[PDB]
Symmetry: C2
Subunit: 398 residues, 2 copies
């Protein structure tokens, strides 16, 4: 009876939901519950640049020794340059410790474990709402986790005054998890003016910003999407940055990401990098080779770098086209502003749980109970069907 | 000054040692400090079966979605079959929870995090000595870590009576880390009789054995090397098993391994699997695809499975040949029994720290300060040079 007290892990309602979508016999059914990018044909793409890199890497069959704890040197440098910009002063001054991680998740974990060890009495604050695994990772890492106001139910927008006042009230060294852009699940983002005002507070109150940038390239392009990170670093604010290549390389299953920490000087950055390697040593020893070689080859080969940025920008524009298409489709029925104001792969539709049920059962369109829709699930084959469905449900009243 | 209290991570003496080996101008220098398998030509091999699988996988360029938290289903089944044997009764009765992990390290981590959560007051016992990262992983996971007698300095063998008595004295649910075979760093292994006697105690005292099998295939073949795991499971003992594919697939840098937990019934195994997935969710969300596809393709394709087992057995025999060659070489000079009695990639030479210095400085042969030599670093080009060196150092006296 050694494991008689091990409780069963709670079933995943999304899995159940997708099982119901599969059994659904209706030809016009639409699934917008899976939060990943699909292309114009509703497929998960293999990016041209990625395929081309893999092809080149294939003609190089060599041994696979252990990587350093911090991962591949070329990868780390490419990632740091991509995130902060090649010309970033914090990069030139050696104030940034960067390592290869297992997706954005791995970066959050390594960061959390480092922070718990050196800031054990700090607590963590996330947005209301936030990515479903933020609370899980940081609570299991040993942190008390709290929330700050963020999404505005009434507007489909941002409670910036309430967000700013809550964060302004935090004690020094409070860890504040922030979406860089393309908020998951709501799609509600700060503008660059709100960002500056938030950084004023974060700096003055000596807080610890942990920026989660999982969608660099899906909001307004690679550079604008990293504004929060780059502006924090230009102003010398102690910042951790977790970036994911799952979405913008379409490499979800090869687990590639980065963790960067911006420190007060190069000496500090090197001590921090060593302790981040320490967190890795206590976890998985060292990261994997395949995905990092692909990413490093794409970012570091100008022809491939260009091909990658081009396809990613086309992905960015396709989502924006779908936002406009569903918006215009809804105008034909019954504040649709949220659909074009929100950004990235997700939108908080503001539909009630009942309306979500109706959308599914009556109109065969599947979104989350929270009202989260994955805009990337929209294409020419279904955007009319969806806009019609949601328009009818909204018009009929809550 | 946010990170003013982050202490510098201690330098790696092995890295320093290898830097000195590189600068060493002597043509006959020999490095036996790197603990990985090298072939007859002193290279890290790419196994034929692995190359052939990679070739086949290359002709299949599809999308890379997230894997399940527990990893690829085909991989898990193949790994479980390889470790316990296809016909194992615990496998047939569904008493084993198996998931894909990030190397053997990742398996130790996921296991440790699960154990800390459900057995928080248990402490951990490792062999004296043990793998350099055992203490680090389990202490950082929140466990008090202790040792039991193991290596016998005077014999180059095993203190089995002292080992058994120490373990017999542990309270229920004590976590006991055990090398399945091919002990790292000493090469001293239990025989199957000692194993049965140890399991008697582990069972009776209701302990929690955590078996670390990082070298299945390098001692006496895949089946015999897993005897401890298979016998624990046949006898119904609650057992965690961490197995690595780094060494026996030569896939160090693609981070592939497994974690298996043997439970009292299938119901328990399923609850445990869910909580192991929980540990993964709190860490890196889900594992990577490339390496697991390669391993699953090799193990599950009979032609490749045969080619793999054959090359691994040839690797196993090459190490044994080097053990005999250095033994016979030492007999030409000055108890050399340890060299043929110890097993796997490592041997504890029993050389003093001074003798290790002499071996390096005078004879250009590099082993660890502990006297650990990697036998796999021996080949026809250097085994005579090494035996001569060690023979002279031993003969000249401590």
């Amino acid at each position: 009876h050694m494991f008689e007290h091990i409780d069963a892990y709670p079933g995943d309602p999304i899995l159940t939901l997708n099982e119901n979508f599969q059994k659904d016999p209706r030809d016009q059914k639409v699934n917008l519950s899976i939060g990943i990018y699909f292309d114009a044909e509703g497929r998960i793409p293999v990016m041209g640049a990625v395929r081309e890199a893999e092809t080149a890497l294939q003609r190089d069959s060599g041994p696979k020794p252990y990587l350093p704890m911090v991962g591949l040197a070329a990868y780390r440098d490419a990632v740091q340059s991509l995130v902060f910009g090649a010309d970033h002063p914090a990069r030139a001054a050696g104030r940034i410790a960067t390592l290869q991680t297992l997706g954005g998740s791995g970066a959050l974990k390594v960061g959390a474990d480092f922070l718990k060890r050196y800031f054990p009495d700090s607590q963590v604050w996330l947005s209301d709402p936030s990515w479903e695994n933020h609370r899980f990772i940081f609570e299991r890492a040993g942190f008390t986790v709290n929330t700050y106001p963020y999404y505005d139910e009434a507007t489909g927008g941002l409670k910036f005054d309430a967000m700013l006042a809550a964060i302004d009230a935090l004690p020094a060294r409070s860890i504040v998890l922030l979406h860089a852009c393309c908020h998951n699940p709501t799609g509600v983002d700060l503008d660059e003016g709100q960002w500056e005002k938030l950084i004023d507070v974060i700096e003055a109150r000596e807080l610890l910003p942990f920026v989660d940038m999982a969608y660099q390239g899906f909001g307004a392009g690679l550079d604008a999407d990293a504004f929060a990170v780059r502006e924090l670093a230009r102003r010398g604010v102690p910042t951790l940055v977790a970036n994911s290549f799952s979405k913008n390389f379409s490499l979800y299953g090869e687990r590639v990401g980065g963790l960067s920490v911006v420190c007060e000087d190069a000496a500090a950055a090197e001590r921090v990098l060593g302790q981040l390697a320490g967190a890795v040593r206590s976890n998985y020893s060292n990261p994997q080779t395949y995905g990092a070689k692909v990413v490093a080859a794409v970012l570091g080969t100008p022809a491939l770098r260009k091909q990658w940025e081009e396809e990613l920008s086309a992905m960015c524009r396709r989502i924006a086209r779908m936002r406009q298409s569903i918006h215009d489709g809804l105008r034909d029925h019954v504040a649709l502003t949220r659909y074009v104001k929100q950004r990235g792969m997700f939108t908080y539709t503001g539909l009630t749980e009942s309306q979500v049920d109706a959308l599914r059962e009556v109109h065969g369109v599947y979104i989350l109970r929270s009202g989260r829709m994955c805009v990337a699930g929209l294409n020419d084959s279904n955007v009319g069907i969806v806009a019609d469905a949601i328009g009818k449900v909204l018009k009929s009243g809550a």
